[PDB]
């Protein structure tokens, strides 16, 4: 028994020779080894001592992955692994340059936020490959237990260390890359609040010494690149937002989606399906048809599923013996995916009087919006607003109605339509909840168009909060709104003057082909919407 | 005794054919044309790749639609052995971890 | 060899040789140590009481760190570490003067409240260094449990002792600088508010004999400088506000922000980015432009990120070899941070 | 060992002198006649009995009025051993009753543990913040408090570890609570309600002059000659800065003035510091209450 235990002690001691064990950790090993010496193999506590000491020896101490510090090589890896993402690539390149000047490895906390399917999770793997790091991914969205972060107590039966502690062994280095998913989706819980634990992780002062619940020793969590992914920044907790560096990843236009699908989505799905380029062919027109009709999202997550379905059916066809090679032409696309899911890009092809197209932004992505007005009845008029409008959205309608009445007095004094009539205002798709003052200027145009009986200029979309006197206030999600407007095939877009920075931060090709108008007062909007 | 009882290098032939696999599924269960079509595609891609473990298939739906019985039918389709990893309680060292 | 009982007992006894053990403390360990002699090593109860004895010996009974009582030395450290915030510095200076008149170490409970990013947490480390005191930091934000504050009985498995007990063990002294963060947003427990246990922690009369569930012996929690951090004093519990001293840390005007950025934010960011003063230079007007048009806030937390971003982009140019030296000017500031965020100050220039 | 360590029939030599008890109570606290009268009646009844006795008393009132501090003085006056129990935000029922001896490392309740260290079956148990006890779903220690605070059933108190009834009578139970509505009705009935009201501005001046300022001076180490606080300055501080029922706010303001004066003497700014109503704002800060009414003449 002792001889077998002696061999266990010797092999454990050999493992820790290479690790640079801290001063306060080696004594923990010595006392555990001493307890292992006086314990019998059949003792229940022997397994706990054997397992816990193994975990302490398994966790690296002072072992760092060999980082890559070549700007040219790292840039080439990033370009070949992903399309676009210039802002993300610029930050990574700057990260390498700073480490080169420092002369040693260092860590940072980064946040990527945008619509799902953009490539937030995939770029993390490419960054780790470019940085010669170890990639680890875990999610905290809808997570309420804090024990998962730091494990459980040693004395508890069937207890294991936390994911970060589990990360150290599998990565076998003290310089890994950690990815956190659905940070904006965390919520308050009765059993415990993991937000406090997340605050310590992302705090450069606090993360230098991290305390777990199994190992019960501080671990230097600094010099670790923390990357977190979210959909929106508003729902992220305020203390967590400060510790995180915000980097925005936007959606892709139809011309951008085809480039991604042609170079990345199709070859990846084809490779995992066991097919080759010669046997399975996907032309550009079918890929274009899939994007226009079979997909509506801003990302390419749904497009990937459609592509994988096509290759799955093609692989089955060749195996069954229908044909040695399958070509996915637009004529036989229905045999693979079926009838198109979306047949109309916009609900109103030609807007009747009282109908104005608007722009909306969500965590899902950009979207188009329509505002319809009608005469509810043939001393004082009234306005009724329908749809799942929020408190802020309903208030903006009241502001728009008041300004619309005042605007008509100074423009058409003889017109008393807005004061002596009952008008019903409805935003279609009433099932989906709506909120925000984004459509303030859209409501004014709809009320003015109905009162004057003049349809608004075709292919025109507008957004922006409107004040009581007519001032146009900036609105968020300009990038998402512009992408949705381009997908909807609009030609003229009206934006607040204070949002000029956000609009011009978009790519050159996205801006090209769009007649953008920047306004500060609604008086300029009136001329654009009603040229005559 | 347990060491010698574990088979090593002894494995029955798998994925005998595709037409017989389809016929086995049609006889085992009625309907599920969409579900059966997916299974045939899963078998076809596995044959092309040559690897048994391409990806894990998860069936979700209303209770009582015979999701469990499909795996038994699938095993007979490509000549495998069926086993059920049914779990009702999540315990670390009760089912998978083992003892000693 | 064959002295496992002796070695454990002798090692524990040696720990109390250099500590001023109170009468009520070493009386308890005597009955615990005698219980070890009559206990079997392989027994499960043996593990529980050995940990209890180890925890008892880990407490630094009567151990006081050599504090600094030099007014001139402490004032110089405080001035060189932070800008402004005279109210916090004045309280610390009076604390040292009282200690000099007292002739012995003393503890106080202080609370700093103000906007985020006004150096409330940063000066806590500076004060501890100036006072030559050990520093411990932990937060009570979203806290809805009482067990970590007090502890658990030895009967329960995995009985985590109180958090304060952990502070005394690592600091190895009875006069640390424990900072309580986010006391304003302490979780209101549906089953029970944990702030009730915090009252005993922050009650100067009750700090003399603080009882925790695990150790089961009172610990002299006096002579400890308790610092509390908060954003709004309204959400702090009323009984907790009575025992805590309110010190206000106001925000910074544009003039004050420029002084902080020029003297503290920029030099620290340069060291963090590994850039020399000559390699990257940020002019005063550039910093003024960043404060005016890029950071509309009371604190300087947002300004620190913008300053780091400019240096981070400058560091890339140096490494890439595009420019041997980088100088930031208002004309080319957009090349580093982009278009200004806040281009206007008021919606109406002339009010109708 | 636990069973034998219990002081069965061991009583401390209580002090039964009314004059001595009257003097001791007045050394540390001002006013509190209702609390002091109850203690005086407690001693008078014990003298008539010829033997020690126990009672259950609950002091309620505004926070910071002296409910917790007077308990220590009462034990010193009564020559009883002092033990303090905290139940604020407490949900562990076993801490009061105990645990079954079958469990490994089982221990008795806190009441039984207190008797062992006290070595006397006549202690003075003080329970703080019984009003805000933890009524969680994990446990309800307030329900277990009924057996602990039952005047008739205290003679036979059963704890899980010992499994033997212990005579918990002859014990003066003092309970502190800021409010009484949150206390359970069965628990409220068993305890005797004693109200400790707040102090008026006139009463606060007496407290500050005789108890707060001398204690602050000893705490700060500043002599009366070095820094002098007069009645008029103290009256101004109470009038415009300390309007709450308790004296905790007044204690901080008095400490602040002495703290500022201590720095001046230490720094060498002044050999002696004299405080006047003109200079009060410099030492303590901006006045809080200045306007007593917003209408001089009501329209
Ligand atoms: N398509 C089918 N063809 C033939 N028999 C079927 C079919 N679907 C279900 N059955 C029969 O109904 C029984 C009930 O199905 P089963 O118990 O497998 O459901 P399940 O999907 O495992 O349910 P649960 O969600 O409750 O776990 C099957 O065992 C089988 O006998
Ligand atoms: N009459 C008095 N004379 C002298 N000191 C007093 C008097 N009343 C209160 N104090 C002092 O005020 C402080 C607060 O007293 P204490 O802590 O007992 O209040 P409390 O009402 O029991 O508090 P809580 O309900 O918050 O626990 C103590 O320092 C005490 O000495
Ligand atoms: N620019 C791009 N270049 C290459 N692949 C991309 C690009 N954008 C998206 N993808 C692909 O689309 C998928 C997006 O899924 P993912 O980003 O993991 O979803 P989520 O953003 O919700 O985490 C990835 O698998 C990635 O391969
Ligand atoms: N007057 C100042 N002098 C130097 N640095 C300052 C000053 N004010 C703020 N800072 C810097 O700004 C940061 C503010 O963070 P801090 O306010 O301590 O966080 P919290 O709000 O959580 O307490 C600190 O890191 C500090 O370095
Ligand atoms: Mg089933
Ligand atoms: Mg009290």
PDB file of N, CA, C and O in Angstrom, chain A residues 501, chain C residues 253-255 257-258 261-262 265-266 269 281-314 328-343:
ATOM      1  N   UNK A 501     -22.230  61.392 -38.380  1.00  0.00           N
ATOM      2  CA  UNK A 501     -21.039  60.607 -38.070  1.00  0.00           C
ATOM      3  C   UNK A 501     -21.304  59.115 -38.231  1.00  0.00           C
ATOM      4  O   UNK A 501     -20.492  58.387 -38.812  1.00  0.00           O
TER       5      UNK A 501
ATOM      6  N   UNK C 253     -14.772  69.690 -13.292  1.00  0.00           N
ATOM      7  CA  UNK C 253     -15.054  70.625 -14.373  1.00  0.00           C
ATOM      8  C   UNK C 253     -14.024  70.401 -15.473  1.00  0.00           C
ATOM      9  O   UNK C 253     -13.042  69.678 -15.273  1.00  0.00           O
ATOM     10  N   UNK C 254     -14.252  71.001 -16.646  1.00  0.00           N
ATOM     11  CA  UNK C 254     -13.343  70.804 -17.771  1.00  0.00           C
ATOM     12  C   UNK C 254     -11.917  71.212 -17.418  1.00  0.00           C
ATOM     13  O   UNK C 254     -10.954  70.591 -17.882  1.00  0.00           O
ATOM     14  N   UNK C 255     -11.762  72.260 -16.606  1.00  0.00           N
ATOM     15  CA  UNK C 255     -10.433  72.645 -16.145  1.00  0.00           C
ATOM     16  C   UNK C 255      -9.806  71.552 -15.289  1.00  0.00           C
ATOM     17  O   UNK C 255      -8.615  71.251 -15.428  1.00  0.00           O
ATOM     18  N   UNK C 257     -10.531  68.331 -15.338  1.00  0.00           N
ATOM     19  CA  UNK C 257     -10.277  67.139 -16.140  1.00  0.00           C
ATOM     20  C   UNK C 257      -8.957  67.247 -16.892  1.00  0.00           C
ATOM     21  O   UNK C 257      -8.218  66.263 -17.009  1.00  0.00           O
ATOM     22  N   UNK C 258      -8.648  68.435 -17.415  1.00  0.00           N
ATOM     23  CA  UNK C 258      -7.401  68.619 -18.147  1.00  0.00           C
ATOM     24  C   UNK C 258      -6.193  68.399 -17.245  1.00  0.00           C
ATOM     25  O   UNK C 258      -5.200  67.792 -17.666  1.00  0.00           O
ATOM     26  N   UNK C 261      -5.884  64.574 -16.636  1.00  0.00           N
ATOM     27  CA  UNK C 261      -5.429  63.858 -17.824  1.00  0.00           C
ATOM     28  C   UNK C 261      -3.965  64.151 -18.128  1.00  0.00           C
ATOM     29  O   UNK C 261      -3.208  63.244 -18.490  1.00  0.00           O
ATOM     30  N   UNK C 262      -3.552  65.412 -17.991  1.00  0.00           N
ATOM     31  CA  UNK C 262      -2.182  65.783 -18.330  1.00  0.00           C
ATOM     32  C   UNK C 262      -1.176  65.147 -17.378  1.00  0.00           C
ATOM     33  O   UNK C 262      -0.094  64.724 -17.802  1.00  0.00           O
ATOM     34  N   UNK C 265      -3.519  60.630 -16.221  1.00  0.00           N
ATOM     35  CA  UNK C 265      -4.071  59.704 -17.205  1.00  0.00           C
ATOM     36  C   UNK C 265      -3.088  59.445 -18.341  1.00  0.00           C
ATOM     37  O   UNK C 265      -2.835  58.292 -18.704  1.00  0.00           O
ATOM     38  N   UNK C 266      -2.531  60.511 -18.921  1.00  0.00           N
ATOM     39  CA  UNK C 266      -1.600  60.341 -20.039  1.00  0.00           C
ATOM     40  C   UNK C 266      -0.327  59.610 -19.628  1.00  0.00           C
ATOM     41  O   UNK C 266       0.053  58.647 -20.315  1.00  0.00           O
ATOM     42  N   UNK C 269      -1.171  55.907 -19.136  1.00  0.00           N
ATOM     43  CA  UNK C 269      -1.508  55.242 -20.390  1.00  0.00           C
ATOM     44  C   UNK C 269      -0.264  54.987 -21.232  1.00  0.00           C
ATOM     45  O   UNK C 269      -0.158  53.948 -21.894  1.00  0.00           O
ATOM     46  N   UNK C 281       3.251  62.267 -28.385  1.00  0.00           N
ATOM     47  CA  UNK C 281       2.988  63.487 -27.636  1.00  0.00           C
ATOM     48  C   UNK C 281       1.548  63.920 -27.864  1.00  0.00           C
ATOM     49  O   UNK C 281       1.081  63.959 -29.007  1.00  0.00           O
ATOM     50  N   UNK C 282       0.853  64.246 -26.778  1.00  0.00           N
ATOM     51  CA  UNK C 282      -0.519  64.736 -26.832  1.00  0.00           C
ATOM     52  C   UNK C 282      -0.538  66.170 -26.328  1.00  0.00           C
ATOM     53  O   UNK C 282      -0.234  66.425 -25.158  1.00  0.00           O
ATOM     54  N   UNK C 283      -0.895  67.101 -27.208  1.00  0.00           N
ATOM     55  CA  UNK C 283      -0.900  68.508 -26.845  1.00  0.00           C
ATOM     56  C   UNK C 283      -2.070  68.823 -25.915  1.00  0.00           C
ATOM     57  O   UNK C 283      -3.029  68.055 -25.791  1.00  0.00           O
ATOM     58  N   UNK C 284      -1.973  69.976 -25.248  1.00  0.00           N
ATOM     59  CA  UNK C 284      -3.001  70.370 -24.291  1.00  0.00           C
ATOM     60  C   UNK C 284      -4.340  70.612 -24.976  1.00  0.00           C
ATOM     61  O   UNK C 284      -5.392  70.229 -24.450  1.00  0.00           O
ATOM     62  N   UNK C 285      -4.326  71.255 -26.146  1.00  0.00           N
ATOM     63  CA  UNK C 285      -5.576  71.519 -26.852  1.00  0.00           C
ATOM     64  C   UNK C 285      -6.213  70.227 -27.350  1.00  0.00           C
ATOM     65  O   UNK C 285      -7.443  70.119 -27.411  1.00  0.00           O
ATOM     66  N   UNK C 286      -5.392  69.242 -27.721  1.00  0.00           N
ATOM     67  CA  UNK C 286      -5.926  67.944 -28.126  1.00  0.00           C
ATOM     68  C   UNK C 286      -6.659  67.288 -26.963  1.00  0.00           C
ATOM     69  O   UNK C 286      -7.762  66.752 -27.127  1.00  0.00           O
ATOM     70  N   UNK C 287      -6.061  67.327 -25.769  1.00  0.00           N
ATOM     71  CA  UNK C 287      -6.736  66.797 -24.590  1.00  0.00           C
ATOM     72  C   UNK C 287      -7.988  67.601 -24.266  1.00  0.00           C
ATOM     73  O   UNK C 287      -9.013  67.033 -23.873  1.00  0.00           O
ATOM     74  N   UNK C 288      -7.922  68.926 -24.420  1.00  0.00           N
ATOM     75  CA  UNK C 288      -9.104  69.754 -24.208  1.00  0.00           C
ATOM     76  C   UNK C 288     -10.196  69.421 -25.215  1.00  0.00           C
ATOM     77  O   UNK C 288     -11.381  69.375 -24.866  1.00  0.00           O
ATOM     78  N   UNK C 289      -9.816  69.190 -26.473  1.00  0.00           N
ATOM     79  CA  UNK C 289     -10.796  68.819 -27.489  1.00  0.00           C
ATOM     80  C   UNK C 289     -11.434  67.473 -27.173  1.00  0.00           C
ATOM     81  O   UNK C 289     -12.639  67.285 -27.381  1.00  0.00           O
ATOM     82  N   UNK C 290     -10.640  66.521 -26.677  1.00  0.00           N
ATOM     83  CA  UNK C 290     -11.183  65.215 -26.316  1.00  0.00           C
ATOM     84  C   UNK C 290     -12.193  65.330 -25.180  1.00  0.00           C
ATOM     85  O   UNK C 290     -13.236  64.668 -25.198  1.00  0.00           O
ATOM     86  N   UNK C 291     -11.897  66.160 -24.179  1.00  0.00           N
ATOM     87  CA  UNK C 291     -12.819  66.335 -23.063  1.00  0.00           C
ATOM     88  C   UNK C 291     -14.101  67.016 -23.527  1.00  0.00           C
ATOM     89  O   UNK C 291     -15.207  66.627 -23.131  1.00  0.00           O
ATOM     90  N   UNK C 292     -13.978  68.036 -24.377  1.00  0.00           N
ATOM     91  CA  UNK C 292     -15.137  68.843 -24.744  1.00  0.00           C
ATOM     92  C   UNK C 292     -16.084  68.085 -25.670  1.00  0.00           C
ATOM     93  O   UNK C 292     -17.305  68.112 -25.479  1.00  0.00           O
ATOM     94  N   UNK C 293     -15.541  67.400 -26.677  1.00  0.00           N
ATOM     95  CA  UNK C 293     -16.357  66.858 -27.756  1.00  0.00           C
ATOM     96  C   UNK C 293     -16.447  65.339 -27.782  1.00  0.00           C
ATOM     97  O   UNK C 293     -17.228  64.803 -28.576  1.00  0.00           O
ATOM     98  N   UNK C 294     -15.685  64.629 -26.950  1.00  0.00           N
ATOM     99  CA  UNK C 294     -15.692  63.174 -26.977  1.00  0.00           C
ATOM    100  C   UNK C 294     -16.135  62.523 -25.676  1.00  0.00           C
ATOM    101  O   UNK C 294     -16.575  61.369 -25.710  1.00  0.00           O
ATOM    102  N   UNK C 295     -16.035  63.211 -24.541  1.00  0.00           N
ATOM    103  CA  UNK C 295     -16.372  62.637 -23.240  1.00  0.00           C
ATOM    104  C   UNK C 295     -17.281  63.612 -22.496  1.00  0.00           C
ATOM    105  O   UNK C 295     -16.800  64.540 -21.839  1.00  0.00           O
ATOM    106  N   UNK C 296     -18.591  63.398 -22.597  1.00  0.00           N
ATOM    107  CA  UNK C 296     -19.578  64.205 -21.880  1.00  0.00           C
ATOM    108  C   UNK C 296     -19.986  63.425 -20.635  1.00  0.00           C
ATOM    109  O   UNK C 296     -20.968  62.682 -20.635  1.00  0.00           O
ATOM    110  N   UNK C 297     -19.215  63.596 -19.563  1.00  0.00           N
ATOM    111  CA  UNK C 297     -19.463  62.886 -18.318  1.00  0.00           C
ATOM    112  C   UNK C 297     -18.805  63.649 -17.180  1.00  0.00           C
ATOM    113  O   UNK C 297     -17.937  64.496 -17.399  1.00  0.00           O
ATOM    114  N   UNK C 298     -19.239  63.340 -15.958  1.00  0.00           N
ATOM    115  CA  UNK C 298     -18.635  63.954 -14.782  1.00  0.00           C
ATOM    116  C   UNK C 298     -17.286  63.335 -14.442  1.00  0.00           C
ATOM    117  O   UNK C 298     -16.379  64.046 -13.994  1.00  0.00           O
ATOM    118  N   UNK C 299     -17.134  62.030 -14.645  1.00  0.00           N
ATOM    119  CA  UNK C 299     -15.901  61.344 -14.333  1.00  0.00           C
ATOM    120  C   UNK C 299     -14.878  61.459 -15.447  1.00  0.00           C
ATOM    121  O   UNK C 299     -15.012  62.241 -16.389  1.00  0.00           O
ATOM    122  N   UNK C 300     -13.825  60.652 -15.323  1.00  0.00           N
ATOM    123  CA  UNK C 300     -12.748  60.637 -16.306  1.00  0.00           C
ATOM    124  C   UNK C 300     -12.527  59.214 -16.799  1.00  0.00           C
ATOM    125  O   UNK C 300     -11.527  58.925 -17.466  1.00  0.00           O
ATOM    126  N   UNK C 301     -13.454  58.311 -16.467  1.00  0.00           N
ATOM    127  CA  UNK C 301     -13.340  56.933 -16.935  1.00  0.00           C
ATOM    128  C   UNK C 301     -13.446  56.856 -18.453  1.00  0.00           C
ATOM    129  O   UNK C 301     -12.689  56.121 -19.099  1.00  0.00           O
ATOM    130  N   UNK C 302     -14.383  57.603 -19.039  1.00  0.00           N
ATOM    131  CA  UNK C 302     -14.496  57.639 -20.494  1.00  0.00           C
ATOM    132  C   UNK C 302     -13.287  58.321 -21.123  1.00  0.00           C
ATOM    133  O   UNK C 302     -12.832  57.920 -22.200  1.00  0.00           O
ATOM    134  N   UNK C 303     -12.760  59.358 -20.468  1.00  0.00           N
ATOM    135  CA  UNK C 303     -11.588  60.051 -20.993  1.00  0.00           C
ATOM    136  C   UNK C 303     -10.370  59.138 -21.009  1.00  0.00           C
ATOM    137  O   UNK C 303      -9.532  59.225 -21.915  1.00  0.00           O
ATOM    138  N   UNK C 304     -10.251  58.259 -20.012  1.00  0.00           N
ATOM    139  CA  UNK C 304      -9.127  57.329 -19.974  1.00  0.00           C
ATOM    140  C   UNK C 304      -9.149  56.387 -21.171  1.00  0.00           C
ATOM    141  O   UNK C 304      -8.100  56.084 -21.752  1.00  0.00           O
ATOM    142  N   UNK C 305     -10.335  55.904 -21.548  1.00  0.00           N
ATOM    143  CA  UNK C 305     -10.442  55.027 -22.709  1.00  0.00           C
ATOM    144  C   UNK C 305     -10.066  55.758 -23.992  1.00  0.00           C
ATOM    145  O   UNK C 305      -9.369  55.203 -24.849  1.00  0.00           O
ATOM    146  N   UNK C 306     -10.520  57.004 -24.143  1.00  0.00           N
ATOM    147  CA  UNK C 306     -10.181  57.776 -25.334  1.00  0.00           C
ATOM    148  C   UNK C 306      -8.686  58.065 -25.403  1.00  0.00           C
ATOM    149  O   UNK C 306      -8.086  58.002 -26.481  1.00  0.00           O
ATOM    150  N   UNK C 307      -8.072  58.393 -24.264  1.00  0.00           N
ATOM    151  CA  UNK C 307      -6.634  58.640 -24.238  1.00  0.00           C
ATOM    152  C   UNK C 307      -5.871  57.377 -24.613  1.00  0.00           C
ATOM    153  O   UNK C 307      -4.907  57.420 -25.387  1.00  0.00           O
ATOM    154  N   UNK C 308      -6.294  56.230 -24.076  1.00  0.00           N
ATOM    155  CA  UNK C 308      -5.639  54.970 -24.407  1.00  0.00           C
ATOM    156  C   UNK C 308      -5.816  54.626 -25.881  1.00  0.00           C
ATOM    157  O   UNK C 308      -4.901  54.085 -26.512  1.00  0.00           O
ATOM    158  N   UNK C 309      -6.988  54.928 -26.444  1.00  0.00           N
ATOM    159  CA  UNK C 309      -7.233  54.634 -27.852  1.00  0.00           C
ATOM    160  C   UNK C 309      -6.289  55.417 -28.755  1.00  0.00           C
ATOM    161  O   UNK C 309      -5.776  54.879 -29.744  1.00  0.00           O
ATOM    162  N   UNK C 310      -6.053  56.692 -28.438  1.00  0.00           N
ATOM    163  CA  UNK C 310      -5.133  57.498 -29.237  1.00  0.00           C
ATOM    164  C   UNK C 310      -3.722  56.929 -29.162  1.00  0.00           C
ATOM    165  O   UNK C 310      -3.031  56.807 -30.180  1.00  0.00           O
ATOM    166  N   UNK C 311      -3.275  56.568 -27.957  1.00  0.00           N
ATOM    167  CA  UNK C 311      -1.944  55.990 -27.807  1.00  0.00           C
ATOM    168  C   UNK C 311      -1.862  54.599 -28.420  1.00  0.00           C
ATOM    169  O   UNK C 311      -0.814  54.224 -28.958  1.00  0.00           O
ATOM    170  N   UNK C 312      -2.943  53.821 -28.340  1.00  0.00           N
ATOM    171  CA  UNK C 312      -2.948  52.496 -28.951  1.00  0.00           C
ATOM    172  C   UNK C 312      -2.793  52.586 -30.463  1.00  0.00           C
ATOM    173  O   UNK C 312      -2.035  51.816 -31.065  1.00  0.00           O
ATOM    174  N   UNK C 313      -3.505  53.522 -31.097  1.00  0.00           N
ATOM    175  CA  UNK C 313      -3.359  53.710 -32.537  1.00  0.00           C
ATOM    176  C   UNK C 313      -1.985  54.269 -32.881  1.00  0.00           C
ATOM    177  O   UNK C 313      -1.401  53.906 -33.908  1.00  0.00           O
ATOM    178  N   UNK C 314      -1.459  55.161 -32.039  1.00  0.00           N
ATOM    179  CA  UNK C 314      -0.120  55.693 -32.265  1.00  0.00           C
ATOM    180  C   UNK C 314       0.933  54.598 -32.150  1.00  0.00           C
ATOM    181  O   UNK C 314       1.903  54.576 -32.914  1.00  0.00           O
ATOM    182  N   UNK C 328       0.050  64.288 -32.052  1.00  0.00           N
ATOM    183  CA  UNK C 328      -1.392  64.437 -32.202  1.00  0.00           C
ATOM    184  C   UNK C 328      -1.732  65.917 -32.269  1.00  0.00           C
ATOM    185  O   UNK C 328      -1.293  66.705 -31.421  1.00  0.00           O
ATOM    186  N   UNK C 329      -2.514  66.295 -33.274  1.00  0.00           N
ATOM    187  CA  UNK C 329      -2.969  67.659 -33.485  1.00  0.00           C
ATOM    188  C   UNK C 329      -4.477  67.663 -33.679  1.00  0.00           C
ATOM    189  O   UNK C 329      -5.058  66.645 -34.067  1.00  0.00           O
ATOM    190  N   UNK C 330      -5.142  68.787 -33.394  1.00  0.00           N
ATOM    191  CA  UNK C 330      -6.600  68.835 -33.594  1.00  0.00           C
ATOM    192  C   UNK C 330      -7.028  68.562 -35.026  1.00  0.00           C
ATOM    193  O   UNK C 330      -8.118  68.016 -35.240  1.00  0.00           O
ATOM    194  N   UNK C 331      -6.210  68.931 -36.014  1.00  0.00           N
ATOM    195  CA  UNK C 331      -6.587  68.707 -37.406  1.00  0.00           C
ATOM    196  C   UNK C 331      -6.633  67.222 -37.743  1.00  0.00           C
ATOM    197  O   UNK C 331      -7.546  66.768 -38.444  1.00  0.00           O
ATOM    198  N   UNK C 332      -5.665  66.445 -37.255  1.00  0.00           N
ATOM    199  CA  UNK C 332      -5.572  65.026 -37.567  1.00  0.00           C
ATOM    200  C   UNK C 332      -6.076  64.140 -36.432  1.00  0.00           C
ATOM    201  O   UNK C 332      -5.802  62.935 -36.426  1.00  0.00           O
ATOM    202  N   UNK C 333      -6.807  64.714 -35.473  1.00  0.00           N
ATOM    203  CA  UNK C 333      -7.336  63.918 -34.371  1.00  0.00           C
ATOM    204  C   UNK C 333      -8.342  62.882 -34.856  1.00  0.00           C
ATOM    205  O   UNK C 333      -8.483  61.819 -34.239  1.00  0.00           O
ATOM    206  N   UNK C 334      -9.044  63.166 -35.956  1.00  0.00           N
ATOM    207  CA  UNK C 334     -10.024  62.217 -36.474  1.00  0.00           C
ATOM    208  C   UNK C 334      -9.367  60.930 -36.954  1.00  0.00           C
ATOM    209  O   UNK C 334     -10.029  59.888 -37.034  1.00  0.00           O
ATOM    210  N   UNK C 335      -8.075  60.977 -37.281  1.00  0.00           N
ATOM    211  CA  UNK C 335      -7.376  59.776 -37.721  1.00  0.00           C
ATOM    212  C   UNK C 335      -7.188  58.768 -36.596  1.00  0.00           C
ATOM    213  O   UNK C 335      -6.879  57.604 -36.871  1.00  0.00           O
ATOM    214  N   UNK C 336      -7.365  59.183 -35.344  1.00  0.00           N
ATOM    215  CA  UNK C 336      -7.177  58.310 -34.191  1.00  0.00           C
ATOM    216  C   UNK C 336      -8.473  57.952 -33.483  1.00  0.00           C
ATOM    217  O   UNK C 336      -8.652  56.798 -33.088  1.00  0.00           O
ATOM    218  N   UNK C 337      -9.384  58.905 -33.308  1.00  0.00           N
ATOM    219  CA  UNK C 337     -10.638  58.641 -32.615  1.00  0.00           C
ATOM    220  C   UNK C 337     -11.861  58.792 -33.510  1.00  0.00           C
ATOM    221  O   UNK C 337     -12.948  58.334 -33.123  1.00  0.00           O
ATOM    222  N   UNK C 338     -11.741  59.407 -34.680  1.00  0.00           N
ATOM    223  CA  UNK C 338     -12.874  59.553 -35.570  1.00  0.00           C
ATOM    224  C   UNK C 338     -13.587  60.882 -35.403  1.00  0.00           C
ATOM    225  O   UNK C 338     -13.079  61.838 -34.810  1.00  0.00           O
ATOM    226  N   UNK C 339     -14.798  60.931 -35.950  1.00  0.00           N
ATOM    227  CA  UNK C 339     -15.596  62.145 -35.886  1.00  0.00           C
ATOM    228  C   UNK C 339     -16.040  62.408 -34.448  1.00  0.00           C
ATOM    229  O   UNK C 339     -16.213  61.466 -33.668  1.00  0.00           O
ATOM    230  N   UNK C 340     -16.218  63.673 -34.065  1.00  0.00           N
ATOM    231  CA  UNK C 340     -16.624  63.974 -32.687  1.00  0.00           C
ATOM    232  C   UNK C 340     -17.991  63.389 -32.361  1.00  0.00           C
ATOM    233  O   UNK C 340     -18.868  63.289 -33.222  1.00  0.00           O
ATOM    234  N   UNK C 341     -18.162  63.000 -31.098  1.00  0.00           N
ATOM    235  CA  UNK C 341     -19.417  62.393 -30.667  1.00  0.00           C
ATOM    236  C   UNK C 341     -20.449  63.461 -30.335  1.00  0.00           C
ATOM    237  O   UNK C 341     -21.582  63.428 -30.829  1.00  0.00           O
ATOM    238  N   UNK C 342     -20.079  64.424 -29.494  1.00  0.00           N
ATOM    239  CA  UNK C 342     -20.974  65.498 -29.069  1.00  0.00           C
ATOM    240  C   UNK C 342     -20.533  66.783 -29.759  1.00  0.00           C
ATOM    241  O   UNK C 342     -19.642  67.485 -29.273  1.00  0.00           O
ATOM    242  N   UNK C 343     -21.161  67.089 -30.891  1.00  0.00           N
ATOM    243  CA  UNK C 343     -20.821  68.274 -31.665  1.00  0.00           C
ATOM    244  C   UNK C 343     -21.603  69.510 -31.247  1.00  0.00           C
ATOM    245  O   UNK C 343     -21.293  70.608 -31.724  1.00  0.00           O
TER     246      UNK C 343
END
